[PDB]
Amino acid sequence: EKVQAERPDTMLGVVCGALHVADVSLRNSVSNFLHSLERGQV
């Protein structure tokens, strides 16, 4: 139909997606690491 419009540039889109993914992953990793540290583990 040629109606797949109103998208951002591919570069900005993939950059933002990778930034969101890495942010969530790093935040969860830091949180779980601190959780293990707090309970008395290494």
Side-chain angles (χ1 to χ4, degrees):
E1 310 193 37
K2 302 186 190 167
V3 302
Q4 297 294 309
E6 298 182 347
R7 295 190 183 182
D9 196 309
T10 300
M11 300 173 63
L12 191 70
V14 69
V15 166
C16 293
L19 285 168
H20 285 295
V21 170
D23 195 70
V24 174
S25 295
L26 294 167
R27 287 178 189 285
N28 299 330
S29 183
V30 160
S31 185
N32 282 312
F33 203 99
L34 193 146
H35 193 54
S36 317
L37 292 166
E38 193 191 344
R39 294 178 288 167
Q41 302 182 348
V42 176

PDB file of all heavy atoms in Angstrom:
ATOM      1  N   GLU A   1       0.809  -1.214   0.000  1.00  0.00           N
ATOM      2  CA  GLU A   1       0.000   0.000   0.000  1.00  0.00           C
ATOM      3  C   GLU A   1       0.850   1.275   0.000  1.00  0.00           C
ATOM      4  O   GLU A   1       0.335   2.360  -0.280  1.00  0.00           O
ATOM      5  CB  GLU A   1      -0.934   0.012   1.212  1.00  0.00           C
ATOM      6  CG  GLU A   1      -1.735  -1.269   1.399  1.00  0.00           C
ATOM      7  CD  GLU A   1      -2.866  -1.118   2.405  1.00  0.00           C
ATOM      8  OE1 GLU A   1      -3.500  -0.042   2.444  1.00  0.00           O
ATOM      9  OE2 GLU A   1      -3.119  -2.082   3.159  1.00  0.00           O
ATOM     10  N   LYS A   2       2.143   1.141   0.309  1.00  0.00           N
ATOM     11  CA  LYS A   2       3.051   2.286   0.412  1.00  0.00           C
ATOM     12  C   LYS A   2       2.556   3.293   1.447  1.00  0.00           C
ATOM     13  O   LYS A   2       2.586   4.504   1.223  1.00  0.00           O
ATOM     14  CB  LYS A   2       3.249   2.967  -0.944  1.00  0.00           C
ATOM     15  CG  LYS A   2       3.798   2.060  -2.030  1.00  0.00           C
ATOM     16  CD  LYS A   2       4.090   2.854  -3.294  1.00  0.00           C
ATOM     17  CE  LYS A   2       4.407   1.948  -4.472  1.00  0.00           C
ATOM     18  NZ  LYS A   2       4.384   2.706  -5.754  1.00  0.00           N
ATOM     19  N   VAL A   3       2.092   2.782   2.590  1.00  0.00           N
ATOM     20  CA  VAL A   3       1.581   3.602   3.683  1.00  0.00           C
ATOM     21  C   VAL A   3       2.411   3.443   4.953  1.00  0.00           C
ATOM     22  O   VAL A   3       1.984   3.888   6.024  1.00  0.00           O
ATOM     23  CB  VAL A   3       0.097   3.298   3.962  1.00  0.00           C
ATOM     24  CG1 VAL A   3      -0.734   3.524   2.708  1.00  0.00           C
ATOM     25  CG2 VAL A   3      -0.093   1.877   4.493  1.00  0.00           C
ATOM     26  N   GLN A   4       3.591   2.823   4.865  1.00  0.00           N
ATOM     27  CA  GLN A   4       4.470   2.661   6.025  1.00  0.00           C
ATOM     28  C   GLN A   4       5.340   3.909   6.145  1.00  0.00           C
ATOM     29  O   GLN A   4       6.548   3.899   5.893  1.00  0.00           O
ATOM     30  CB  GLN A   4       5.313   1.397   5.892  1.00  0.00           C
ATOM     31  CG  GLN A   4       4.501   0.108   5.867  1.00  0.00           C
ATOM     32  CD  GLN A   4       3.800  -0.162   7.185  1.00  0.00           C
ATOM     33  OE1 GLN A   4       4.420  -0.131   8.248  1.00  0.00           O
ATOM     34  NE2 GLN A   4       2.498  -0.413   7.123  1.00  0.00           N
ATOM     35  N   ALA A   5       4.697   5.003   6.545  1.00  0.00           N
ATOM     36  CA  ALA A   5       5.322   6.304   6.714  1.00  0.00           C
ATOM     37  C   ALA A   5       5.285   6.703   8.187  1.00  0.00           C
ATOM     38  O   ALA A   5       4.885   5.916   9.055  1.00  0.00           O
ATOM     39  CB  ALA A   5       4.622   7.336   5.823  1.00  0.00           C
ATOM     40  N   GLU A   6       5.717   7.932   8.468  1.00  0.00           N
ATOM     41  CA  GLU A   6       5.710   8.492   9.821  1.00  0.00           C
ATOM     42  C   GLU A   6       6.583   7.665  10.765  1.00  0.00           C
ATOM     43  O   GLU A   6       6.215   7.387  11.909  1.00  0.00           O
ATOM     44  CB  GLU A   6       4.282   8.614  10.360  1.00  0.00           C
ATOM     45  CG  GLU A   6       3.400   9.549   9.555  1.00  0.00           C
ATOM     46  CD  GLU A   6       2.013   9.689  10.143  1.00  0.00           C
ATOM     47  OE1 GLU A   6       1.656   8.877  11.022  1.00  0.00           O
ATOM     48  OE2 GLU A   6       1.281  10.613   9.729  1.00  0.00           O
ATOM     49  N   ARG A   7       7.763   7.270  10.266  1.00  0.00           N
ATOM     50  CA  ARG A   7       8.795   6.614  11.053  1.00  0.00           C
ATOM     51  C   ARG A   7       9.968   7.570  11.273  1.00  0.00           C
ATOM     52  O   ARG A   7      10.186   8.476  10.462  1.00  0.00           O
ATOM     53  CB  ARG A   7       9.323   5.348  10.373  1.00  0.00           C
ATOM     54  CG  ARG A   7       8.312   4.228  10.221  1.00  0.00           C
ATOM     55  CD  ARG A   7       9.002   2.948   9.771  1.00  0.00           C
ATOM     56  NE  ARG A   7       8.066   1.849   9.548  1.00  0.00           N
ATOM     57  CZ  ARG A   7       8.417   0.614   9.192  1.00  0.00           C
ATOM     58  NH1 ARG A   7       9.692   0.289   9.014  1.00  0.00           N
ATOM     59  NH2 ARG A   7       7.484  -0.310   9.014  1.00  0.00           N
ATOM     60  N   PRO A   8      10.741   7.410  12.346  1.00  0.00           N
ATOM     61  CA  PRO A   8      11.978   8.182  12.468  1.00  0.00           C
ATOM     62  C   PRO A   8      13.066   7.592  11.585  1.00  0.00           C
ATOM     63  O   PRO A   8      12.921   6.510  11.012  1.00  0.00           O
ATOM     64  CB  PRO A   8      12.330   8.056  13.950  1.00  0.00           C
ATOM     65  CG  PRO A   8      11.804   6.725  14.327  1.00  0.00           C
ATOM     66  CD  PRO A   8      10.560   6.506  13.499  1.00  0.00           C
ATOM     67  N   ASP A   9      14.163   8.337  11.465  1.00  0.00           N
ATOM     68  CA  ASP A   9      15.328   7.830  10.751  1.00  0.00           C
ATOM     69  C   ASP A   9      15.793   6.525  11.383  1.00  0.00           C
ATOM     70  O   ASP A   9      15.713   6.344  12.602  1.00  0.00           O
ATOM     71  CB  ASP A   9      16.459   8.859  10.767  1.00  0.00           C
ATOM     72  CG  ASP A   9      17.535   8.566   9.733  1.00  0.00           C
ATOM     73  OD1 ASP A   9      18.030   7.420   9.684  1.00  0.00           O
ATOM     74  OD2 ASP A   9      17.883   9.486   8.962  1.00  0.00           O
ATOM     75  N   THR A  10      16.259   5.603  10.536  1.00  0.00           N
ATOM     76  CA  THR A  10      16.683   4.291  11.014  1.00  0.00           C
ATOM     77  C   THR A  10      17.817   4.408  12.024  1.00  0.00           C
ATOM     78  O   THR A  10      17.850   3.676  13.019  1.00  0.00           O
ATOM     79  CB  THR A  10      17.110   3.423   9.829  1.00  0.00           C
ATOM     80  OG1 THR A  10      16.008   3.266   8.928  1.00  0.00           O
ATOM     81  CG2 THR A  10      17.577   2.054  10.297  1.00  0.00           C
ATOM     82  N   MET A  11      18.746   5.339  11.788  1.00  0.00           N
ATOM     83  CA  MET A  11      19.879   5.505  12.694  1.00  0.00           C
ATOM     84  C   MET A  11      19.413   5.920  14.083  1.00  0.00           C
ATOM     85  O   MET A  11      19.793   5.301  15.085  1.00  0.00           O
ATOM     86  CB  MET A  11      20.857   6.539  12.127  1.00  0.00           C
ATOM     87  CG  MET A  11      21.448   6.178  10.767  1.00  0.00           C
ATOM     88  SD  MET A  11      22.431   7.506  10.028  1.00  0.00           S
ATOM     89  CE  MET A  11      23.775   7.694  11.204  1.00  0.00           C
ATOM     90  N   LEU A  12      18.579   6.958  14.162  1.00  0.00           N
ATOM     91  CA  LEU A  12      18.091   7.410  15.459  1.00  0.00           C
ATOM     92  C   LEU A  12      17.244   6.336  16.128  1.00  0.00           C
ATOM     93  O   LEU A  12      17.349   6.122  17.341  1.00  0.00           O
ATOM     94  CB  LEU A  12      17.292   8.702  15.296  1.00  0.00           C
ATOM     95  CG  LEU A  12      16.930   9.450  16.584  1.00  0.00           C
ATOM     96  CD1 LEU A  12      18.167  10.066  17.220  1.00  0.00           C
ATOM     97  CD2 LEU A  12      15.881  10.515  16.312  1.00  0.00           C
ATOM     98  N   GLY A  13      16.414   5.635  15.351  1.00  0.00           N
ATOM     99  CA  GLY A  13      15.578   4.596  15.926  1.00  0.00           C
ATOM    100  C   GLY A  13      16.381   3.467  16.544  1.00  0.00           C
ATOM    101  O   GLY A  13      16.137   3.074  17.690  1.00  0.00           O
ATOM    102  N   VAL A  14      17.358   2.939  15.804  1.00  0.00           N
ATOM    103  CA  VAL A  14      18.144   1.823  16.320  1.00  0.00           C
ATOM    104  C   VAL A  14      19.011   2.284  17.485  1.00  0.00           C
ATOM    105  O   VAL A  14      19.202   1.546  18.462  1.00  0.00           O
ATOM    106  CB  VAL A  14      18.973   1.175  15.190  1.00  0.00           C
ATOM    107  CG1 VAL A  14      20.087   2.090  14.700  1.00  0.00           C
ATOM    108  CG2 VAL A  14      19.542  -0.163  15.633  1.00  0.00           C
ATOM    109  N   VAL A  15      19.524   3.519  17.422  1.00  0.00           N
ATOM    110  CA  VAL A  15      20.319   4.048  18.526  1.00  0.00           C
ATOM    111  C   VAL A  15      19.479   4.133  19.793  1.00  0.00           C
ATOM    112  O   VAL A  15      19.904   3.689  20.868  1.00  0.00           O
ATOM    113  CB  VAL A  15      20.910   5.420  18.142  1.00  0.00           C
ATOM    114  CG1 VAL A  15      21.456   6.148  19.369  1.00  0.00           C
ATOM    115  CG2 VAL A  15      22.005   5.256  17.100  1.00  0.00           C
ATOM    116  N   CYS A  16      18.275   4.702  19.690  1.00  0.00           N
ATOM    117  CA  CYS A  16      17.413   4.836  20.859  1.00  0.00           C
ATOM    118  C   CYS A  16      17.008   3.473  21.408  1.00  0.00           C
ATOM    119  O   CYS A  16      16.983   3.271  22.628  1.00  0.00           O
ATOM    120  CB  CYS A  16      16.179   5.659  20.499  1.00  0.00           C
ATOM    121  SG  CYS A  16      16.540   7.388  20.114  1.00  0.00           S
ATOM    122  N   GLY A  17      16.682   2.527  20.524  1.00  0.00           N
ATOM    123  CA  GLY A  17      16.324   1.197  20.989  1.00  0.00           C
ATOM    124  C   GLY A  17      17.456   0.517  21.732  1.00  0.00           C
ATOM    125  O   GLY A  17      17.248  -0.070  22.801  1.00  0.00           O
ATOM    126  N   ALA A  18      18.673   0.592  21.186  1.00  0.00           N
ATOM    127  CA  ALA A  18      19.816  -0.014  21.858  1.00  0.00           C
ATOM    128  C   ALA A  18      20.097   0.679  23.184  1.00  0.00           C
ATOM    129  O   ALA A  18      20.466   0.025  24.166  1.00  0.00           O
ATOM    130  CB  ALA A  18      21.044   0.036  20.949  1.00  0.00           C
ATOM    131  N   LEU A  19      19.910   2.001  23.236  1.00  0.00           N
ATOM    132  CA  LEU A  19      20.098   2.723  24.489  1.00  0.00           C
ATOM    133  C   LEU A  19      19.102   2.262  25.544  1.00  0.00           C
ATOM    134  O   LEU A  19      19.478   2.040  26.700  1.00  0.00           O
ATOM    135  CB  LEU A  19      19.969   4.232  24.255  1.00  0.00           C
ATOM    136  CG  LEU A  19      21.154   4.931  23.576  1.00  0.00           C
ATOM    137  CD1 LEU A  19      20.767   6.338  23.136  1.00  0.00           C
ATOM    138  CD2 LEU A  19      22.366   4.984  24.492  1.00  0.00           C
ATOM    139  N   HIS A  20      17.834   2.096  25.163  1.00  0.00           N
ATOM    140  CA  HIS A  20      16.834   1.626  26.119  1.00  0.00           C
ATOM    141  C   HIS A  20      17.156   0.220  26.606  1.00  0.00           C
ATOM    142  O   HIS A  20      17.081  -0.062  27.812  1.00  0.00           O
ATOM    143  CB  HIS A  20      15.443   1.657  25.485  1.00  0.00           C
ATOM    144  CG  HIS A  20      14.856   3.029  25.355  1.00  0.00           C
ATOM    145  ND1 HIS A  20      14.525   3.803  26.446  1.00  0.00           N
ATOM    146  CD2 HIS A  20      14.515   3.752  24.263  1.00  0.00           C
ATOM    147  CE1 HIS A  20      14.017   4.950  26.030  1.00  0.00           C
ATOM    148  NE2 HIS A  20      14.001   4.945  24.710  1.00  0.00           N
ATOM    149  N   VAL A  21      17.517  -0.676  25.681  1.00  0.00           N
ATOM    150  CA  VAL A  21      17.838  -2.051  26.054  1.00  0.00           C
ATOM    151  C   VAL A  21      19.016  -2.085  27.018  1.00  0.00           C
ATOM    152  O   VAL A  21      18.965  -2.748  28.064  1.00  0.00           O
ATOM    153  CB  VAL A  21      18.118  -2.892  24.794  1.00  0.00           C
ATOM    154  CG1 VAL A  21      18.686  -4.258  25.171  1.00  0.00           C
ATOM    155  CG2 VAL A  21      16.851  -3.059  23.963  1.00  0.00           C
ATOM    156  N   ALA A  22      20.097  -1.377  26.682  1.00  0.00           N
ATOM    157  CA  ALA A  22      21.276  -1.368  27.538  1.00  0.00           C
ATOM    158  C   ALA A  22      20.975  -0.736  28.886  1.00  0.00           C
ATOM    159  O   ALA A  22      21.490  -1.184  29.915  1.00  0.00           O
ATOM    160  CB  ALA A  22      22.417  -0.629  26.846  1.00  0.00           C
ATOM    161  N   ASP A  23      20.139   0.305  28.908  1.00  0.00           N
ATOM    162  CA  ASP A  23      19.780   0.932  30.174  1.00  0.00           C
ATOM    163  C   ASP A  23      19.060  -0.054  31.082  1.00  0.00           C
ATOM    164  O   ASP A  23      19.425  -0.204  32.255  1.00  0.00           O
ATOM    165  CB  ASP A  23      18.909   2.161  29.918  1.00  0.00           C
ATOM    166  CG  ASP A  23      18.808   3.064  31.127  1.00  0.00           C
ATOM    167  OD1 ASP A  23      19.822   3.704  31.479  1.00  0.00           O
ATOM    168  OD2 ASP A  23      17.716   3.134  31.731  1.00  0.00           O
ATOM    169  N   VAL A  24      18.057  -0.756  30.548  1.00  0.00           N
ATOM    170  CA  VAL A  24      17.311  -1.707  31.365  1.00  0.00           C
ATOM    171  C   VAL A  24      18.225  -2.827  31.846  1.00  0.00           C
ATOM    172  O   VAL A  24      18.204  -3.205  33.028  1.00  0.00           O
ATOM    173  CB  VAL A  24      16.105  -2.258  30.581  1.00  0.00           C
ATOM    174  CG1 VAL A  24      15.406  -3.357  31.374  1.00  0.00           C
ATOM    175  CG2 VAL A  24      15.123  -1.141  30.258  1.00  0.00           C
ATOM    176  N   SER A  25      19.057  -3.362  30.948  1.00  0.00           N
ATOM    177  CA  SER A  25      19.932  -4.472  31.312  1.00  0.00           C
ATOM    178  C   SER A  25      20.941  -4.063  32.381  1.00  0.00           C
ATOM    179  O   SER A  25      21.136  -4.787  33.362  1.00  0.00           O
ATOM    180  CB  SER A  25      20.642  -4.998  30.069  1.00  0.00           C
ATOM    181  OG  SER A  25      19.710  -5.564  29.168  1.00  0.00           O
ATOM    182  N   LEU A  26      21.580  -2.902  32.216  1.00  0.00           N
ATOM    183  CA  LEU A  26      22.581  -2.464  33.180  1.00  0.00           C
ATOM    184  C   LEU A  26      21.945  -2.132  34.522  1.00  0.00           C
ATOM    185  O   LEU A  26      22.512  -2.450  35.574  1.00  0.00           O
ATOM    186  CB  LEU A  26      23.339  -1.257  32.629  1.00  0.00           C
ATOM    187  CG  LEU A  26      24.214  -1.524  31.399  1.00  0.00           C
ATOM    188  CD1 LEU A  26      24.673  -0.221  30.753  1.00  0.00           C
ATOM    189  CD2 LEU A  26      25.412  -2.390  31.759  1.00  0.00           C
ATOM    190  N   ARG A  27      20.767  -1.501  34.511  1.00  0.00           N
ATOM    191  CA  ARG A  27      20.092  -1.199  35.767  1.00  0.00           C
ATOM    192  C   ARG A  27      19.727  -2.474  36.513  1.00  0.00           C
ATOM    193  O   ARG A  27      19.942  -2.573  37.728  1.00  0.00           O
ATOM    194  CB  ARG A  27      18.844  -0.358  35.503  1.00  0.00           C
ATOM    195  CG  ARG A  27      19.133   1.085  35.124  1.00  0.00           C
ATOM    196  CD  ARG A  27      17.850   1.839  34.842  1.00  0.00           C
ATOM    197  NE  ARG A  27      18.090   3.165  34.276  1.00  0.00           N
ATOM    198  CZ  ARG A  27      18.519   4.222  34.963  1.00  0.00           C
ATOM    199  NH1 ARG A  27      18.779   4.138  36.264  1.00  0.00           N
ATOM    200  NH2 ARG A  27      18.694   5.379  34.338  1.00  0.00           N
ATOM    201  N   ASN A  28      19.195  -3.472  35.803  1.00  0.00           N
ATOM    202  CA  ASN A  28      18.828  -4.720  36.463  1.00  0.00           C
ATOM    203  C   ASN A  28      20.059  -5.457  36.973  1.00  0.00           C
ATOM    204  O   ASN A  28      20.036  -6.031  38.069  1.00  0.00           O
ATOM    205  CB  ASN A  28      18.029  -5.600  35.506  1.00  0.00           C
ATOM    206  CG  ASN A  28      16.742  -4.941  35.052  1.00  0.00           C
ATOM    207  OD1 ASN A  28      16.148  -4.145  35.780  1.00  0.00           O
ATOM    208  ND2 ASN A  28      16.303  -5.268  33.843  1.00  0.00           N
ATOM    209  N   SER A  29      21.150  -5.443  36.199  1.00  0.00           N
ATOM    210  CA  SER A  29      22.374  -6.103  36.637  1.00  0.00           C
ATOM    211  C   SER A  29      22.929  -5.449  37.895  1.00  0.00           C
ATOM    212  O   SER A  29      23.305  -6.141  38.848  1.00  0.00           O
ATOM    213  CB  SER A  29      23.410  -6.075  35.515  1.00  0.00           C
ATOM    214  OG  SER A  29      24.589  -6.765  35.890  1.00  0.00           O
ATOM    215  N   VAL A  30      22.980  -4.114  37.920  1.00  0.00           N
ATOM    216  CA  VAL A  30      23.450  -3.401  39.102  1.00  0.00           C
ATOM    217  C   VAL A  30      22.554  -3.694  40.298  1.00  0.00           C
ATOM    218  O   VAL A  30      23.042  -3.911  41.416  1.00  0.00           O
ATOM    219  CB  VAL A  30      23.538  -1.890  38.805  1.00  0.00           C
ATOM    220  CG1 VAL A  30      23.544  -1.056  40.091  1.00  0.00           C
ATOM    221  CG2 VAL A  30      24.783  -1.588  37.979  1.00  0.00           C
ATOM    222  N   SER A  31      21.235  -3.707  40.091  1.00  0.00           N
ATOM    223  CA  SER A  31      20.319  -3.934  41.203  1.00  0.00           C
ATOM    224  C   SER A  31      20.501  -5.329  41.785  1.00  0.00           C
ATOM    225  O   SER A  31      20.573  -5.500  43.005  1.00  0.00           O
ATOM    226  CB  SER A  31      18.878  -3.730  40.742  1.00  0.00           C
ATOM    227  OG  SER A  31      17.981  -3.823  41.833  1.00  0.00           O
ATOM    228  N   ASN A  32      20.598  -6.341  40.923  1.00  0.00           N
ATOM    229  CA  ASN A  32      20.767  -7.705  41.415  1.00  0.00           C
ATOM    230  C   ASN A  32      22.134  -7.901  42.058  1.00  0.00           C
ATOM    231  O   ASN A  32      22.265  -8.645  43.040  1.00  0.00           O
ATOM    232  CB  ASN A  32      20.562  -8.698  40.274  1.00  0.00           C
ATOM    233  CG  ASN A  32      19.099  -8.908  39.949  1.00  0.00           C
ATOM    234  OD1 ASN A  32      18.280  -9.134  40.839  1.00  0.00           O
ATOM    235  ND2 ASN A  32      18.757  -8.825  38.670  1.00  0.00           N
ATOM    236  N   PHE A  33      23.162  -7.237  41.528  1.00  0.00           N
ATOM    237  CA  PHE A  33      24.484  -7.312  42.139  1.00  0.00           C
ATOM    238  C   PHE A  33      24.459  -6.728  43.545  1.00  0.00           C
ATOM    239  O   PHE A  33      24.983  -7.330  44.493  1.00  0.00           O
ATOM    240  CB  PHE A  33      25.496  -6.579  41.261  1.00  0.00           C
ATOM    241  CG  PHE A  33      26.914  -7.018  41.471  1.00  0.00           C
ATOM    242  CD1 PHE A  33      27.506  -7.925  40.610  1.00  0.00           C
ATOM    243  CD2 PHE A  33      27.658  -6.521  42.527  1.00  0.00           C
ATOM    244  CE1 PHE A  33      28.809  -8.328  40.798  1.00  0.00           C
ATOM    245  CE2 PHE A  33      28.963  -6.925  42.719  1.00  0.00           C
ATOM    246  CZ  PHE A  33      29.538  -7.828  41.855  1.00  0.00           C
ATOM    247  N   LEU A  34      23.834  -5.559  43.703  1.00  0.00           N
ATOM    248  CA  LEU A  34      23.728  -4.950  45.023  1.00  0.00           C
ATOM    249  C   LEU A  34      22.866  -5.802  45.944  1.00  0.00           C
ATOM    250  O   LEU A  34      23.109  -5.863  47.153  1.00  0.00           O
ATOM    251  CB  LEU A  34      23.156  -3.536  44.901  1.00  0.00           C
ATOM    252  CG  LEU A  34      23.265  -2.636  46.136  1.00  0.00           C
ATOM    253  CD1 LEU A  34      23.480  -1.199  45.697  1.00  0.00           C
ATOM    254  CD2 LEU A  34      22.034  -2.734  47.034  1.00  0.00           C
ATOM    255  N   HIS A  35      21.853  -6.468  45.388  1.00  0.00           N
ATOM    256  CA  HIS A  35      21.013  -7.353  46.186  1.00  0.00           C
ATOM    257  C   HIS A  35      21.824  -8.512  46.748  1.00  0.00           C
ATOM    258  O   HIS A  35      21.723  -8.835  47.938  1.00  0.00           O
ATOM    259  CB  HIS A  35      19.855  -7.873  45.336  1.00  0.00           C
ATOM    260  CG  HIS A  35      18.775  -8.538  46.131  1.00  0.00           C
ATOM    261  ND1 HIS A  35      18.155  -7.925  47.199  1.00  0.00           N
ATOM    262  CD2 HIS A  35      18.205  -9.761  46.015  1.00  0.00           C
ATOM    263  CE1 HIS A  35      17.248  -8.743  47.707  1.00  0.00           C
ATOM    264  NE2 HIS A  35      17.259  -9.862  47.007  1.00  0.00           N
ATOM    265  N   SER A  36      22.631  -9.153  45.900  1.00  0.00           N
ATOM    266  CA  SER A  36      23.475 -10.249  46.367  1.00  0.00           C
ATOM    267  C   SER A  36      24.493  -9.759  47.392  1.00  0.00           C
ATOM    268  O   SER A  36      24.745 -10.436  48.398  1.00  0.00           O
ATOM    269  CB  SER A  36      24.180 -10.905  45.185  1.00  0.00           C
ATOM    270  OG  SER A  36      23.290 -11.068  44.094  1.00  0.00           O
ATOM    271  N   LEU A  37      25.097  -8.594  47.148  1.00  0.00           N
ATOM    272  CA  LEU A  37      26.037  -8.028  48.113  1.00  0.00           C
ATOM    273  C   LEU A  37      25.371  -7.774  49.462  1.00  0.00           C
ATOM    274  O   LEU A  37      25.956  -8.057  50.515  1.00  0.00           O
ATOM    275  CB  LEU A  37      26.633  -6.728  47.567  1.00  0.00           C
ATOM    276  CG  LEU A  37      27.569  -6.839  46.361  1.00  0.00           C
ATOM    277  CD1 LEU A  37      27.790  -5.466  45.734  1.00  0.00           C
ATOM    278  CD2 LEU A  37      28.895  -7.460  46.759  1.00  0.00           C
ATOM    279  N   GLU A  38      24.146  -7.239  49.452  1.00  0.00           N
ATOM    280  CA  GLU A  38      23.488  -6.854  50.696  1.00  0.00           C
ATOM    281  C   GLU A  38      23.180  -8.067  51.565  1.00  0.00           C
ATOM    282  O   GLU A  38      23.274  -7.995  52.796  1.00  0.00           O
ATOM    283  CB  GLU A  38      22.203  -6.085  50.385  1.00  0.00           C
ATOM    284  CG  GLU A  38      21.587  -5.375  51.583  1.00  0.00           C
ATOM    285  CD  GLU A  38      20.192  -4.857  51.295  1.00  0.00           C
ATOM    286  OE1 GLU A  38      19.822  -4.782  50.105  1.00  0.00           O
ATOM    287  OE2 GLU A  38      19.466  -4.533  52.258  1.00  0.00           O
ATOM    288  N   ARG A  39      22.809  -9.187  50.947  1.00  0.00           N
ATOM    289  CA  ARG A  39      22.431 -10.376  51.699  1.00  0.00           C
ATOM    290  C   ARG A  39      23.614 -11.073  52.358  1.00  0.00           C
ATOM    291  O   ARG A  39      23.394 -11.976  53.174  1.00  0.00           O
ATOM    292  CB  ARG A  39      21.711 -11.367  50.781  1.00  0.00           C
ATOM    293  CG  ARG A  39      20.362 -10.877  50.273  1.00  0.00           C
ATOM    294  CD  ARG A  39      19.727 -11.888  49.330  1.00  0.00           C
ATOM    295  NE  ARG A  39      20.400 -11.939  48.032  1.00  0.00           N
ATOM    296  CZ  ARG A  39      20.221 -12.896  47.121  1.00  0.00           C
ATOM    297  NH1 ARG A  39      19.397 -13.911  47.341  1.00  0.00           N
ATOM    298  NH2 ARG A  39      20.881 -12.842  45.973  1.00  0.00           N
ATOM    299  N   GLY A  40      24.845 -10.684  52.030  1.00  0.00           N
ATOM    300  CA  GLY A  40      26.036 -11.289  52.591  1.00  0.00           C
ATOM    301  C   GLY A  40      26.813 -12.179  51.647  1.00  0.00           C
ATOM    302  O   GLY A  40      27.692 -12.914  52.108  1.00  0.00           O
ATOM    303  N   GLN A  41      26.517 -12.139  50.350  1.00  0.00           N
ATOM    304  CA  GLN A  41      27.207 -12.944  49.354  1.00  0.00           C
ATOM    305  C   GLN A  41      28.240 -12.107  48.608  1.00  0.00           C
ATOM    306  O   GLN A  41      28.286 -10.879  48.723  1.00  0.00           O
ATOM    307  CB  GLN A  41      26.210 -13.546  48.365  1.00  0.00           C
ATOM    308  CG  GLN A  41      25.143 -14.400  49.016  1.00  0.00           C
ATOM    309  CD  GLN A  41      24.198 -15.023  48.004  1.00  0.00           C
ATOM    310  OE1 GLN A  41      24.197 -14.656  46.828  1.00  0.00           O
ATOM    311  NE2 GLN A  41      23.391 -15.971  48.458  1.00  0.00           N
ATOM    312  N   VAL A  42      29.080 -12.797  47.843  1.00  0.00           N
ATOM    313  CA  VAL A  42      30.130 -12.183  47.041  1.00  0.00           C
ATOM    314  C   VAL A  42      30.033 -12.736  45.628  1.00  0.00           C
ATOM    315  O   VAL A  42      29.997 -13.956  45.436  1.00  0.00           O
ATOM    316  CB  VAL A  42      31.525 -12.450  47.633  1.00  0.00           C
ATOM    317  CG1 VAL A  42      32.610 -11.875  46.723  1.00  0.00           C
ATOM    318  CG2 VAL A  42      31.614 -11.880  49.046  1.00  0.00           C
TER     319      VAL A  42
END
